[PDB]
Ligand binder design. Structure first.
Ligand SMILES: Nc1ncnc2c1ncn2[C@@H]1O[C@H](COP(=O)(O)OP(=O)(O)OP(=O)(O)O)[C@@H](O)[C@H]1O
Ligand SMILES: Nc1ncnc2c1ncn2[C@@H]1O[C@H](COP(=O)(O)OP(=O)(O)OP(=O)(O)O)[C@@H](O)[C@H]1O
Ligand SMILES: Cc1cn([C@H]2C[C@H](O)[C@@H](COP(=O)(O)OP(=O)(O)OP(=O)(O)O)O2)c(=O)[nH]c1=O
Ligand SMILES: [Mg+2]
Ligand SMILES: [Mg+2]
Ligand SMILES: [Mn+2]
Ligand SMILES: [Mn+2]
Ligand SMILES: [Mn+2]
Ligand SMILES: [Mn+2]
Lengths: 683, 289, 289, 683
């Protein structure tokens, strides 16, 4: 066993009844003085390194050609001047195993952390040396972390796409279904997770040109997509991951759910395609009143009204659907469907739950389209227009397929540096650059939506780490007050940066004029309610930083009205799974699953303590499963009120609790304004 | 919790030797080398001899000491399969491939063979040591039985499966596959009966029974390695056969509710080719907060 | 001269109760009087007990002491039929026709019934008295087994046959006829083994063995009379059943090579009415025409 | 049990030791007296019937509008003047259960046999009343039978395409694979059987964008295609049928074959995807000499030579591939592979066998392309060019995808009418019309090849029926003499009609000038070998008909040289599954499987004796399984020497014969010039 492995395992060997957390630090030293420094490839100077990486097809030469070598040297020197040290063994291990650039045979390490950060910063700046240094300082301080696609692939010749998630709308036609399968394979080839809205597809037993009971429903398309994602599995490196979203009022909703039952037959079971359910407020109202609900056949509704079932408001059209004899429907028990959802989530963690009305009551771009589904991580909530892929030799009507670039603020590092504004603006600029340089030649709706919406996702990580390292319980009202203030600041500065980009470029996102940003409605709660901390401890935490007031929000509203906004969507809180290790941060705004996690790598086992875990903050690092899910819902709703897109909200459940407890948590989330629920992980 | 389910699976797997026509094997048998024919004969005789012990002693002795009418019935069914089906099937394969004089000589050789005898007598010794109303001695015999059903047969099964996976000796390979499928379920069933006894013991007694099982496995395994080289070196297969023995040893341990002893290994692809949370209704007022 | 043909006959007679759907008897059962249903349940319960012990004890123990792998294979197969097929079939019948409480009650009734306990005590006692390498103790147990197969079952068989012959309970009756067909060949086979041992004796020893057989038969007979009256008086059939058991006692004696002991009588005519492809390698000559 | 069913089951009841065959005739009468006439919709006049069928969207207005009502009435009167009577119950039952037009509620019969024949004739003639009457006389004499798609769908508005055999070339790209899946779905939606060539696809473990061990091979593509064919199942009417062809020198050939093994796992086995193997002469030579063969990685060959492995002649390329270090290959035993093919055919009848050199040594259009694969029925053998389907908003390079037009001559009816020439020419004209009226808007290469090649398949059926009713054993040399003469006349008149159509329209098929028809090579064996019958009995059979001599063939060769040929391909012998029942004929040129076949429809049993079966010809109606497969191969080769495309050739084996016998039959078929082997049906 390696020396650093033994040093890391020495953490759990208690001394005087206490964990040896400091041993972890020793491990990193070993991991660098025995493996990383020996396995790294050193050159005489930076010129030889850059030339070797360029000619050997490791780096794209275009982004490096925008800078003179003196500027690149200055950027690299700025990166190395911080003398960044990984405080935990797992941070360095995760970076050098998942994100550091290696040779073709993967026998040596070509990129250090500073090298990777410098390359990403130079790609972000697009020829601006000062901007590149700003990005270097932002990432080496670990205030901002680009998503895994962006951080791993920026400036690389053998790179994939920098966009993490893609959302596709599938129209009710064989041509559209085949095009959706093709685009899903193309985007999984690019490495991104693909989500498909199957609510427009007509249910099982519908007519294909006057011959009835002909359609296979959404389950056949689900099987096709599952095989497509199995085939396109990132060249066999990462399993192809897809998501299917169906409205709960679709007739196939049961069969949909039956794809995830552990007793499902092979002709129905789907195993590589995640499932999500979109629940309008009408379904929750029907379940609450115990009135029997009706699921609908989408094609009959489309024939009668000319629009898809998910294209209009069910809260106002459900009674018209039910009373219409030309609309076909089936009777269901909404409470039984809710119990089935809870049982499925207990068994397998599926489906994802999207509260459609919670998303669309604060959605700023309802004029473009209502949000009808979410992404594979159930945090992207954007307007999408379905595409009409016609026959060959016929022009296709290209719609809008959602796609946003992810980037997370490290809350602990951002607040320690007292740089919410600067970090938010620089992250917005980096995400705007990632969107601008993204061009996908096989997904036309994705390309058009990227060019028009200009949507980005700016997330946050290390919420629980910051709260526990500052002596604040994650479930406490003080923690929710901190989240309210911090994310109001993040939203304020993201809107300010979006408006500044719109002013400097003279262009807004497409159809911005009909948005609530243009009409000023979006700023209502910000121009009437003060989001400054209500607790003295939180206010002290925010000292040295100008917390925006109602007057600052009014000025920002006027600025947006004058100049517009460059981005249709700005903030989305992704799960941030593996890149949180490198940043020494807790995953996303979720509470920690465990204080010390035991992970098996190779034939060895490693223990990763939570960042900053110690004796004095052991009980502030409360495990998520031990927490009240209602207070976690309260925290997520408090954050969500300042996030325009959704938050990947994983439910952390105990084995003792029943499906009724899961249903109660889901209904409280819906009541509190939670937009989406990601996972039901049971301990 | 399990006997009626195993009853069902056992009786629905019922088969007879006459169902598979054997004569068409002579069309591939004639094309094997002397070493291949020799190894096959010796392996076959090894399986035959061990399976006879299981039919005459192993299954009937366990059926005798186990309490429960339904368990005795399942065990009787398994004993029947050994004596009435498996034994006739092995005889049929032999009579098809070799003349009478060759069969008698192979059995004389394998009967005198040191490695075959060592394992055969070790297993039989544990069956003979069962004492009335002593569940510890019964458990030890069950461990021996599981080791025979789920482990010791497999150094032998390897070769017919190896041919079967190549398109050679397909009729006898089909028979062997049916036999093997019976021994697999026999091993799992007897394993569950052993775990029942094991779970009735104290922690110290459990640790002692674990040591017994591992010690026995070690003795049998070291003899299997020698048995394997003795038969398979002449056809160049011993390395791969050894991987197959360890893989099946791990299955035998899992049948007894124990952890695998050996690291996971991949198996020869030719041989491979041959081979709820509590639901609680919503009570209303759960929609109001 | 006979084992192979018995082996073939036994295996070709193989069956499972699940092959016969029983829901067709539901109405003719519903229509019987309470007395008739009571006698029927108890009769089959008495049969279940006999087959339980014949399968658990009788057939396996005789198999253990009889020499020859083929003889053992036949006896092992017969043992399996007793407890895995016959005894279980009665539960299939019970589970179809009767509610759980009536089923529970009848199994409690077998435990406390003095005639059923006496006959089990006597038969199983003789099985457990067999001494290794002692042919006389083995003969005595084989006589007991023939008396169970060919005599003792028949006080029970009468009633299902009596109904079958009237076109009542015909699915249950089909099961019973299959059981009876098996017991007839089991009684003949064990009878032939008993005769083998008897024929080895001196004339003096033979005279003692006949005394044993006749004394045992009379003792079992007297007990069976009381059992028969106890069950059949409430349905008015005791005298008829008694004639039937005497008829079958003579058949048991004949299976043992002895002269009939009871005089012939007319049996109820109703009861009489109740009775991959083969693979060759390619030669170089197959590529030229 | 209905009266006609009792009269049909009375056939098996033997009177005087003989089957009551004549009782079948009575059954037909009952089937018409009790059922057909009662459930047949009758109209006061044909005008009302046509108006009702057109208005209720049963027929098409376009093809009926080309004639005056007087001409349509005259065509219908010509059809009804024959007073055609079905000779067997199964003929009428199959027509009125499969082909007769029924109401939307499927309880009444709108079309009789004469009505359907008249409608198909009017569709064929395209406005010519005399041509329509000629077609009516052709089909009511039952001399020619349009295929099931053409016969069922001609003139019907609610219909699929008239072509049901489609051959697709799949290029080695994700875009091309997705396009192939889409086209397969679209063509299965149209009701056609789709065959895909997977030899150009790179094997498992190949590089994608210079990353190693990334390709899933052709098995993942087969899984995708199998899912696509399961999804597209004719609107839930028939099981989606597809075929995949792989060259035997493709490395995936074993895994390909492993998709049909019973022991294959769920992630390996494809259930609704037929498989065929293309066997070049090089593989047969390697197996014959027992030399170990090499299966090649297609992408390495493409990188080294710039052409696909299946696009070059393996006979001259195999040694260069083996000796090339940059071509990756795996060692195999060709005899073991042949034994595996025989074993798989014994178990399941798969794969289809295509002898590439047997096809291409007589292929007339090798300049366009060599025949690389066959159809789902393994009788279509045409040149195909792969298409380069690029990314979106990029022009695709459309190639040639085979789609031939099926139609079968009834040999008994054709020869008893002494009308080989007239029937062949009229069938060629009808096939040309159906090919010209086919327009598929979702298969670009299929449409392009239909427009360019103008390939049709004119088959024959009732060969064994005709031979048995004329006292000729199917295995006799006289039967082969008759087949030789009859199919040489069929080829002669097909070529003459193609040249006449080319002269009339002034156009040939695309790239005809490079064909062997243009160079006169095709006619070589016809201008030197006389194909007149060598037996007096066969000559008397051909009495009253002019048999083309060598001088006639020389004149035809000169005519083709002067005027060209309209069709790239003319003759292909399809299995003719259900149309053989309606025509009261034996299926294809295959020998009969059973003298009397027992079928179960609903809960009723029915008995179909072979047409013309009696006590006198009971011995001549020998069953196919009892026949020597070598003599069946000889007859099929005798026919194949006059057929430009292939013949659906099913092997009929007994359970006693082993895989050595199957391999011997396959090798004798290869030796005798058999192009394709369809199925290995074991009795
Ligand atoms: N935790 C760590 N994170 C990142 N790099 C590390 C870490 N530990 C060691 N290294 C690398 O290994 C080298 C070993 O030097 P070390 O940290 O022991 O101190 P040093 O030799 O006094 O110099 P310095 O600390 O100034 O780099 C470091 O210079 C650095 O490049
Ligand atoms: N074998 C058959 N094949 C086809 N149609 C038949 C057959 N038998 C009867 N029919 C149909 O039933 C009708 C009645 O025919 P039938 O044998 O009674 O005498 P017919 O002289 O042909 O009658 P019609 O006056 O109808 O022409 C036929 O006209 C035809 O429509
Ligand atoms: C072709 C086909 C379609 N479908 C379903 C899936 C599609 O969502 C739906 C629409 O198919 P379409 O491609 O729209 O079929 P269509 O346009 O010819 O019919 P229509 O005019 O009614 O739109 O039909 C199947 O389930 N199986 C099939 O094989
Ligand atoms: Mg449509
Ligand atoms: Mg490519
Ligand atoms: Mn056995
Ligand atoms: Mn066994
Ligand atoms: Mn019995
Ligand atoms: Mn018995």
């Amino acid at each position: 066993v390696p020396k650093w492995i033994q040093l890391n395992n020495e953490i759990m060997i208690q001394k005087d009844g206490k964990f040896q957390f400091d041993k972890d630090k020793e491990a990193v030293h070993s991991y660098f003085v025995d493996y990383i420094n020996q396995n790294t490839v050193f050159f005489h100077n930076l010129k030889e390194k850059l030339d070797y990486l360029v000619e050997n097809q490791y780096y794209e030469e275009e982004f490096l050609s925008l800078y003179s070598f003196e500027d690149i040297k200055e950027v690299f020197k700025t990166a190395y001047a911080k003398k960044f040290r990984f405080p935990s063994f797992m941070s360095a291990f995760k970076f050098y195993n998942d994100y550091a650039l290696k040779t073709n045979d993967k026998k040596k390490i070509l990129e250090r952390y500073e090298d990777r950060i410098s390359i990403v910063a130079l790609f972000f700046a697009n020829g601006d040396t000062e901007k590149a240094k700003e990005y270097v300082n932002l990432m080496i301080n670990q205030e901002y972390q680009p998503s895994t696609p962006t951080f791993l692939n920026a400036g690389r010749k053998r790179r994939g796409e920098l966009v993490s998630c893609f959302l596709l709308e599938v129209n009710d036609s064989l041509n559209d279904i085949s095009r959706a399968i093709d685009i899903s394979m193309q985007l999984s080839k690019l490495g991104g997770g693909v989500s498909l809205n199957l609510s427009k597809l007509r249910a099982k037993g519908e007519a294909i040109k006057d011959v009835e009971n002909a359609t296979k429903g959404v389950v056949g398309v689900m099987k096709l997509l599952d095989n497509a994602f199995r085939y396109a599995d990132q060249m066999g490196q990462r399993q192809g991951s897809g998501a299917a979203y169906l409205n709960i009022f679709h007739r196939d909703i049961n069969d949909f759910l039956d794809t995830k039952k552990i007793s499902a037959d092979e002709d129905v079971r789907v195993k590589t395609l995640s499932i999500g359910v979109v629940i309008p407020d009408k379904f929750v109202e029907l379940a609450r009143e115990d009135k029997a609900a009706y699921v609908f056949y989408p094609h009959t509704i489309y024939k009668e009204y000319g629009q898809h079932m998910d294209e209009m408001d069910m809260n106002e059209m459900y009674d018209k659907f039910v009373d219409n004899p030309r609309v076909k429907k089936e009777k269901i028990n909404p409470r039984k469907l809710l119990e089935k959802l809870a049982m499925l989530r207990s068994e397998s963690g599926y489906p994802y739950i999207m509260f459609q009305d919670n998303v669309n009551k604060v959605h700023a771009n309802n004029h473009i389209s209502k949000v009808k589904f979410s992404n594979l991580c159930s945090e992207v909530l954007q307007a999408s227009q379905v595409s009409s892929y016609t026959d060959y030799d016929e022009e296709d009507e290209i719609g809008l397929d959602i796609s946003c670039n992810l980037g997370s603020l490290n809350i602990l590092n951002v607040m320690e540096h007292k740089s919410i504004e600067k970090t938010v603006k620089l992250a917005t600029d980096s995400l705007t650059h990632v969107s601008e340089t993204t061009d996908i030649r096989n997904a036309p709706a994705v390309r058009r939506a990227n060019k028009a919406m200009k949507s980005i996702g700016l997330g946050a990580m290390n919420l629980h780490g910051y709260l526990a390292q500052n002596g604040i319980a994650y479930e406490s009202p003080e923690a929710r007050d901190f989240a309210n203030t911090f994310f109001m600041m993040v939203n304020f500065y993201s809107i300010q940066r979006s408006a500044e980009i719109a002013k400097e470029k003279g262009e807004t996102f497409d159809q911005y004029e009909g948005s609530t940003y243009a009409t000023g409605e979006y700023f209502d709660k910000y121009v009437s309610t003060d989001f400054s901390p209500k607790y003295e401890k939180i206010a002290n935490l925010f000292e040295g930083m100008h917390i925006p007031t109602t007057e600052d929000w009014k000025k920002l509203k006027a600025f947006v009205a004058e100049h517009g906004m460059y981005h249709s969507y700005r903030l989305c809180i992704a799960p941030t799974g593996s890149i949180s290790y490198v940043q020494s941060s807790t995953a996303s705004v979720m509470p920690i699953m465990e204080r010390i996690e035991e992970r098996t790598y190779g034939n060895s086992k490693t223990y990763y303590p939570m960042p900053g875990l110690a004796s004095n903050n052991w009980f502030f690092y409360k495990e998520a499963y031990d927490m009240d899910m209602f207070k976690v819902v309260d925290m997520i709703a408090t954050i969500q009120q300042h996030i325009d897109q959704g938050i990947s909200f994983t439910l952390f459940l105990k084995d003792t609790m029943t499906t009724r407890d899961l249903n109660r948590i889901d209904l409280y989330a819906h009541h509190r304004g939670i937009k989406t629920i990601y996972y039901a992980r049971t301990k | 919790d399990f006997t009626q389910m195993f009853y069902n699976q056992n009786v629905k797997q019922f088969w007879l030797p006459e169902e598979i026509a054997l004569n068409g094997d002579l069309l591939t048998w004639k094309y094997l080398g002397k070493n291949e024919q020799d190894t096959y004969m010796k392996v076959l005789a090894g399986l035959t001899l061990l399976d006879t012990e299981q039919g005459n002693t192993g299954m009937p002795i366990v059926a005798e000491h186990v309490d429960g009418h339904q368990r005795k019935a399942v065990l009787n069914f398994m004993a029947m399969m050994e004596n009435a089906v498996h034994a006739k099937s092995y005889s049929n394969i032999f009579m098809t491939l070799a003349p009478t004089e060759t069969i008698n000589e192979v059995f004389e050789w394998v009967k005198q063979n040191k490695y075959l005898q060592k394992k055969a007598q070790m297993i039989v010794g544990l069956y003979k040591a069962i004492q009335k109303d002593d569940e510890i001695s019964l458990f030890k015999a069950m461990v021996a039985s599981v080791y025979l059903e789920s482990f010791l047969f497999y150094s032998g099964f390897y070769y017919p499966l190896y041919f079967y996976g190549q398109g050679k000796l397909m009729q006898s390979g089909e028979i062997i596959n049916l036999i093997l499928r019976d021994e697999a379920i026999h091993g799992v069933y007897v394993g569950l009966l052993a775990q029942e006894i094991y779970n009735k013991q104290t922690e110290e007694k459990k640790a002692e029974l674990r040591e017994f099982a591992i010690d026995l496995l070690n003795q049998l395994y070291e003899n299997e390695l020698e048995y394997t080289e003795d038969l398979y070196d002449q056809v160049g297969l011993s390395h791969d056969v050894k991987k197959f023995i360890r893989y099946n040893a791990n299955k035998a341990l899992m049948n007894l509710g124990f952890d695998p002893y050996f690291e996971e290994e991949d198996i020869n692809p030719i041989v491979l080719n041959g081979l709820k949370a509590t639901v609680e209704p919503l009570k209303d007022d759960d929609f109001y907060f």
